């Protein structure tokens, strides 16, 4: 993938419960796998800011619940490092549901987004209200 322009300490694991920052009808998401990832023995597969993840819908509307869809990690509680040395962290851990062509499933994105996620997934950027 295209360089994030930041060093990330993966804050999520397979089985982690995160917030769905969009109007799709999905409220809570469960991390299943991380695109392009291959671990090591005993290691819980890790997910972080800017990673495209396969997800499960835990809480939401009946039509959206129990569905296995792709998503992009948009926010995380564990700090990330910007080239200017500064660390950046969020209030919660969040993701935006995405389709085959990396375009958001919803129309409106709830809460802020990292500038690095914007550089990578353009159609998610030009759908965001606040970019930090």
């Amino acid at each position: 993938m295209e360089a994030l322009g930041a060093d990330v300490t993966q804050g999520l694991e397979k089985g982690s419960l995160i917030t769905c920052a969009d109007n799709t009808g999905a409220r809570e998401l469960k991390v299943i796998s991380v695109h392009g990832y291959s671990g090591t023995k005993n290691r819980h597969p890790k997910a972080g800011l800017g990673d495209k993840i396969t997800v499960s819908v835990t809480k939401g509307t009946p039509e959206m619940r129990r569905q296995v869809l792709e998503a992009v990690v948009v926010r995380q509680r564990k700090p990330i490092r910007r080239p200017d040395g500064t660390r950046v962290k969020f209030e919660d851990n969040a993701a935006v549901i995405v389709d085959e062509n990396e375009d958001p499933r919803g129309t409106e994105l709830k809460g802020p987004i990292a500038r690095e996620v914007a550089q990578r997934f353009g159609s998610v950027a030009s759908a965001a209200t606040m970019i930090v």
Binding site: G85, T86, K89, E91
Partner: protein
């Protein structure tokens, strides 16, 4: 830059930036300030802080 809590000049290549739920941004110079802020204490009421004095 200047710390959004205590008010001292943050050393470049140091510090953390907290991004709130609404989108607000709070730059911190140290862990001490992050901790005092999470305790519900306001900078103006703490005598050691630059904002207070």
């Amino acid at each position: 830059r200047e710390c959004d809590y205590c008010g001292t000049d943050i050393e470049p290549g140091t510090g953390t930036m907290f991004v709130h739920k609404d989108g607000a941004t709070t730059h911190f110079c140290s862990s001490k300030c992050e901790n005092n802020a999470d305790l519900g204490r306001e900078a103006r009421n703490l005598e050691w802080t630059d904002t207070a004095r």
